[PDB]
Amino acid sequence: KGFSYLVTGVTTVGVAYAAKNAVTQFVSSMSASADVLALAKIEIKLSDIPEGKNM
Amino acid sequence: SASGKWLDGIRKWYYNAAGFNKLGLMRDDTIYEDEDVKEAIRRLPENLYNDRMFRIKRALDLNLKHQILPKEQWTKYEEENFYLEPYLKEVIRERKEREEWAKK
Amino acid sequence: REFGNLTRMRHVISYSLSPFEQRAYPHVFTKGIPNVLRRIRESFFRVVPQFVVFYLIYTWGTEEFERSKRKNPAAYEND
Amino acid sequence: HTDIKVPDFSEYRRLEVLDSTKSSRESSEAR
Amino acid sequence: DLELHPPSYPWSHRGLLSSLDHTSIRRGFQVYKQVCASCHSMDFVAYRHLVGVCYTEDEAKELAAEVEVQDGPNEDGEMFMRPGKLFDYFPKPYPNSEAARAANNGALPPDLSYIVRARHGGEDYVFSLLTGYCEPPTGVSLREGLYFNPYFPGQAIAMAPPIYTDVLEFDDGTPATMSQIAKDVCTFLRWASEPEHDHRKRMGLKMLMMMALLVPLVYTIKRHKWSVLKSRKLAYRPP
Amino acid sequence: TPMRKTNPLMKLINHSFIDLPTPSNISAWWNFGSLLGACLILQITTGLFLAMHYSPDASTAFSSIAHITRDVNYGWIIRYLHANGASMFFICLFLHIGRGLYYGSFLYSETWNIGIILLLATMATAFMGYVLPWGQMSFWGATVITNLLSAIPYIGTDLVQWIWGGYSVDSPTLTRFFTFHFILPFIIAALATLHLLFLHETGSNNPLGITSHSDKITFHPYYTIKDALGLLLFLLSLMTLTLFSPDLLGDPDNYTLANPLNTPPHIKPEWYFLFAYTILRSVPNKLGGVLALLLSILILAMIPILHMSKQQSMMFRPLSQSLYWLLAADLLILTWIGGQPVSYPFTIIGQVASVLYFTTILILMPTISLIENKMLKW
Amino acid sequence: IWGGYSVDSPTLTRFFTFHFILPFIIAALATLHLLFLHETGSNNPLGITSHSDKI
Amino acid sequence: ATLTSKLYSLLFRRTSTFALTIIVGVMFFERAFDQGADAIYDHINEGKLWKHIKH
Amino acid sequence: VTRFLGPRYRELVKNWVPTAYTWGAVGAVGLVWATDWRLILDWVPYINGKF
Amino acid sequence: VTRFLGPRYRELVKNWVPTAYTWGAVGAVGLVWATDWRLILDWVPYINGKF
Numbered sequence A: 001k002g003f004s005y006l007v008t009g010v011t012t013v014g015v016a017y018a019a020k021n022a023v024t025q026f027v028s029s030m031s032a033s034a035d036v037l038a039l040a041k042i043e044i045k046l047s048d049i050p051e052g053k054n055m
Numbered sequence B: 001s002a003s004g005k006w007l008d009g010i011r012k013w014y015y016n017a018a019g020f021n022k023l024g025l026m027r028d029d030t031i032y033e034d035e036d037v038k039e040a041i042r043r044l045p046e047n048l049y050n051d052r053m054f055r056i057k058r059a060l061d062l063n064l065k066h067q068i069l070p071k072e073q074w075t076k077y078e079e080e081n082f083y084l085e086p087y088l089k090e091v092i093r094e095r096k097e098r099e100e101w102a103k104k
Numbered sequence C: 001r002e003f004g005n006l007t008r009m010r011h012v013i014s015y016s017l018s019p020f021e022q023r024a025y026p027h028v029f030t031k032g033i034p035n036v037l038r039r040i041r042e043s044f045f046r047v048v049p050q051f052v053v054f055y056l057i058y059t060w061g062t063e064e065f066e067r068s069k070r071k072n073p074a075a076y077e078n079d
Numbered sequence D: 001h002t003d004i005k006v007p008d009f010s011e012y013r014r015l016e017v018l019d020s021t022k023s024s025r026e027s028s029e030a031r
Numbered sequence E: 001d002l003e004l005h006p007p008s009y010p011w012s013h014r015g016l017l018s019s020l021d022h023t024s025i026r027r028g029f030q031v032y033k034q035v036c037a038s039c040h041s042m043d044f045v046a047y048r049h050l051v052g053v054c055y056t057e058d059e060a061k062e063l064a065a066e067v068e069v070q071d072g073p074n075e076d077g078e079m080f081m082r083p084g085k086l087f088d089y090f091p092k093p094y095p096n097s098e099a100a101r102a103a104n105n106g107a108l109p110p111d112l113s114y115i116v117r118a119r120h121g122g123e124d125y126v127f128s129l130l131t132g133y134c135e136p137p138t139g140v141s142l143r144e145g146l147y148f149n150p151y152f153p154g155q156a157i158a159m160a161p162p163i164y165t166d167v168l169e170f171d172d173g174t175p176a177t178m179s180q181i182a183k184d185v186c187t188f189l190r191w192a193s194e195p196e197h198d199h200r201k202r203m204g205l206k207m208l209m210m211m212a213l214l215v216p217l218v219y220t221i222k223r224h225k226w227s228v229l230k231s232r233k234l235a236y237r238p239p
Numbered sequence F: 001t002p003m004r005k006t007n008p009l010m011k012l013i014n015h016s017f018i019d020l021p022t023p024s025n026i027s028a029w030w031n032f033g034s035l036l037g038a039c040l041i042l043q044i045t046t047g048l049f050l051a052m053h054y055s056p057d058a059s060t061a062f063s064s065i066a067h068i069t070r071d072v073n074y075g076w077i078i079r080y081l082h083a084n085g086a087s088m089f090f091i092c093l094f095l096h097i098g099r100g101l102y103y104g105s106f107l108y109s110e111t112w113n114i115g116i117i118l119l120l121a122t123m124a125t126a127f128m129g130y131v132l133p134w135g136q137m138s139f140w141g142a143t144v145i146t147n148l149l150s151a152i153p154y155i156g157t158d159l160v161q162w163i164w165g166g167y168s169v170d171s172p173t174l175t176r177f178f179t180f181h182f183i184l185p186f187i188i189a190a191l192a193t194l195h196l197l198f199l200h201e202t203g204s205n206n207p208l209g210i211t212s213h214s215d216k217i218t219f220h221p222y223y224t225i226k227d228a229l230g231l232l233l234f235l236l237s238l239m240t241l242t243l244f245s246p247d248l249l250g251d252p253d254n255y256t257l258a259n260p261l262n263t264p265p266h267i268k269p270e271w272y273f274l275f276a277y278t279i280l281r282s283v284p285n286k287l288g289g290v291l292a293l294l295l296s297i298l299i300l301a302m303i304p305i306l307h308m309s310k311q312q313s314m315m316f317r318p319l320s321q322s323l324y325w326l327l328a329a330d331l332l333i334l335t336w337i338g339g340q341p342v343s344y345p346f347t348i349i350g351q352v353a354s355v356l357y358f359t360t361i362l363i364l365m366p367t368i369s370l371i372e373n374k375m376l377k378w
Numbered sequence G: 001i002w003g004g005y006s007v008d009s010p011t012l013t014r015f016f017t018f019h020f021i022l023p024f025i026i027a028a029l030a031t032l033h034l035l036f037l038h039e040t041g042s043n044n045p046l047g048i049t050s051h052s053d054k055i
Numbered sequence H: 001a002t003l004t005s006k007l008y009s010l011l012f013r014r015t016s017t018f019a020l021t022i023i024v025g026v027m028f029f030e031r032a033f034d035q036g037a038d039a040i041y042d043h044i045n046e047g048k049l050w051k052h053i054k055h
Numbered sequence I, J: 001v002t003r004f005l006g007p008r009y010r011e012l013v014k015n016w017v018p019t020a021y022t023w024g025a026v027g028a029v030g031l032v033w034a035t036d037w038r039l040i041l042d043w044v045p046y047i048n049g050k051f
């Protein structure tokens, strides 16, 4: 029974590894895309003097 | 006023305010039917069980047509009988005994 | 759960009439309108008061909000 | 078994034609 | 202080089965061409949409051909000007929002295609905005580029009073009073916001008649089917 | 034997719809389940025809909606039916929940939980669908509701940005919301099938709150026409809304293209969320407000456990009846205040209303139930 | 079907919507498939009734 | 002999004839109701609708 | 098909022929009306006006 | 809840406490592994590939 349970456990370990890889890939696909990510911190504002009010 | 019978008066007021009089229903006909009430109904004598079925069916028929039993035929607070109370108390007591045995 | 076996009822006899034999609107004025009126009377004093309180609160809140934004005579009078 | 007579339904029945020449089949057809 | 609530005017089309006055729509469109079109855009209205409401197809074509528009690249990959067709939308006064802001003292003139539906009070507001241009109250000051308008939320609008008596000559010949001009403009803007107004009213009348026919009939059918239960009598006969 | 009893599909249809034993005394309040099903079918069809012309891009969504209403033949009626049909869907949903609460229908615990899941799915579907137009209201309401998830203590910002698909609401968020809005109603239909499956185990309840096995009735020749009449009345109300007051329940701010820079002075969600909105404004803490909203929606799960009365229905419980109508008036107060801005009277009345909403269905209702039990000497 | 005089953006959007909806209809139709299969049960390679060796 | 009885004996007895009568009535009712509703709406807005201006 | 080759099946077909004709007419008129088929609706009086 | 107040239920809870602890550990380690928390995955001797 220990040998059989060892076979089952190794199979479950492999299945869990594959499942996590797939789920993480899909979830990351739902995350921010490369083009959106690029135009995030690179842009730097160059602001002039807009009188004495909030702009 | 508060001299004891005031409680009876407010109970009578609540009983009249509750509308199951208008449908010719006894208070024990209005009880929610859970497992204990189901077994208490099963333990009722056949005549009481039949009387209950008609009273409820008549109430359902009146409610379907949105009508009301005549004022004379309304169930009276003084006249009301609690036929299911003994059986329900017995079933609840037996269940509590079983639970107390289980927890021991 | 079919209609055959649901409950045990004994000697309860019911009489019904064909839909075509009878009229679709019986007792419209003799019973129907008084029945609707008595139903409304029964439910009125248990439903309406809550909404009357709601309407009072609504009116008072709207008027108070109006008053809050039309004020401050003394705030500029001291000037 | 013998005391079971249908209660009066006349207050719900349609205003059937009183001509008395209209056969029951004809009145049923009209309704 | 919160902006003044516009007073509900008795618009002709405000009725349940009323329709837009298409003469008023034509006059309002004319005023849009003459006055509004200089700075306000209508990106969602073409020179069609007018074949069925006010102008005929030939008249709409003649109207559209008046203004030339940029066309797609020809040979050599060069964009050229074209006389202008029905499917072309109304001309855009400014190439982009930045040009509009530069030409209007930093303020962007909103698109008028939805302006009636985009403002609380609808056309009723717009009329008031074009109507009330009182001088600033005692104790308020504003920049040169702004004009006091009580119905504007900030009371300081960047639009100079756009219409006045005899600013344009109506083709019909009605007196070009500023009030008449404003009413016609608001009617046209309402039409632009709701081109389906007349069709919606017609379908509403038809469905009202349909429901008036059906609801009593379906209720009678339900009563007929349920009469057996509604009138059935039951008796209890214990032995 | 008739064909109904032979073909398995006919077996299911006859057992569940044609020949389903239902109480005869069922009132008009039970007509809103069929109305909700009709609302779902109408929303699915109308949204399909709308999406046939809708482009889910931040740069073209507003123009696509304008093209639908102006160019697509009979496009205005379809869009109006979808908008006012969502409004009618939430009206019918609120009335269905009110009936379930009033007539002790929450005692069908599994059915009640499936209904709670259905309500959550419908709320999410309507939220994303309202985001779809990409108007000013759509953009700013989407930003507010999505930023609501930043209250999460540890994974707050990461979750919000993951939902956004970026650092702020933009085109990827709009496309995400369009796809979710497309998928969700079919999940809602499946959840409704589970709803009906769990309901059929016990059967429908009746206003009296007393077993009706004596007076069961077939559904085909009675409740079919009763529901048809209900559907006719619902369609009449919907056509009045779409043909005479198309913008009665709408905010005249989704007709301005969404600019992420300027925010409209009065940003409010759609009316059926206003009560929830008030809850957020009631609690001074951000996480407190989010939790209060979650409890405001999820307290329906705790309602069955708080049923301390010996009678299922409230028609024989005048005190609980008055408490229920007080709760309904409180909900109306919450909605009205959610419509109104933040100021001196509105904020305090909204806080009082939120406290009353939480206390009535958590304290006052069980105490009144126990008092009634004592008053009936059992 | 085209939505015009030739395949264009109208056709693509219609096809996208149909492509979105149709697989769920396929899933429901597959549930009906399994429901109608359930009445008689699965068949075996021999082509003989397997009520003796059900599992 | 009431008109309803004659109609029942002639058309309403057989349900297929009932459906045929229903469909013919649908055609004629659609035509007449559409014409009447259009006439009513046009009369209410005689001076506003474009149709008169076009003439 | 062989079993149906009998006199009483012919009698049944004769009995149900009027029903089949009525249902065919129902279907045909419904198809003409639903599609507003101009080719056929150009002959029926009082409908020709609607074109 | 009142019915559960008894010595037998206390014995049952004592019996099932190891199972509850083991399942809680299963859930916690599974969450850490799935999310790659790295707050906790830094302490573990191996699994220090998150440089």
Ligand code: HEC
Pocket: E031, E035, E036, E038, E039, E040, E104, E107, E108, E109, E110, E112, E115, E119, E126, E129, E130, E152, E156, E157, E158, E159, E160, E162, E163, E185
């Ligand atoms: C440049 C000259 C100018 C012309 C002429 C003009 N507008 Fe405007 N309009 C503006 C500007 C600039 C604004 C926005 C000002 C601001 O937001 O501070 C504006 C705003 C508006 C508003 C209100 C928008 C709001 O946010 O309340 C309406 C309505 C409008 N325009 C329509 C019209 C109509 C009707 C006319 C009648 C011919 C007209 N415009 C003519 C420049 C003009």
Ligand code: HEM
Pocket: F029, F030, F031, F032, F033, F034, F036, F037, F040, F093, F096, F097, F100, F105, F106, F108, F111, F112, F114, F115, F116, F118, F119, F122, F188, F192, F195, F196, F199, F203, F204, F205, F206, F300
């Ligand atoms: C899309 C959403 C929903 C659909 C399609 C739906 C459908 C239905 C239908 C058709 C019924 C049949 C009985 C009736 O019509 O009253 C029903 C019953 C019921 N529903 Fe729903 N429902 C929905 C949402 C909800 C919600 C939000 C709740 C509770 C919060 C709920 C709880 C119940 C309960 C308790 C019943 C039992 C009825 C009874 O006791 O007779 N449902 N539902």
Ligand code: HEM
Pocket: F040, F043, F044, F045, F046, F047, F048, F050, F051, F054, F065, F079, F082, F083, F086, F089, F122, F125, F126, F129, F130, F131, F132, F133, F181, F182, F185, F188, F254
């Ligand atoms: C659960 C049922 C549904 C509800 C409650 C719902 C709700 C809404 C709401 C409130 C809007 C915004 C309407 C507006 O302000 O203009 C909307 C828009 C939209 N919905 Fe749905 N919807 C439902 C089902 C569907 C389905 C099944 C589709 C399938 C494609 C769909 C597609 C759309 C589209 C494309 C829009 C954008 C066009 C528009 O704004 O009218 N909806 N929906």
Ligand code: HEM
Pocket: G026, G030, G033, G034, G037, G041, G042, G043, G044
């Ligand atoms: C999306 C497409 C389909 C799905 C999901 C599906 C699903 C299934 C499943 C799960 C079974 C159970 C038995 C097995 O797996 O062999 C089955 C059986 C069957 N399917 Fe389908 N099927 C599909 C398409 C088809 C097609 C295209 C046909 C015929 C042209 C078909 C005819 C059958 C038949 C005759 C059986 C009976 C098997 C037996 O008797 O053992 N199915 N189907």
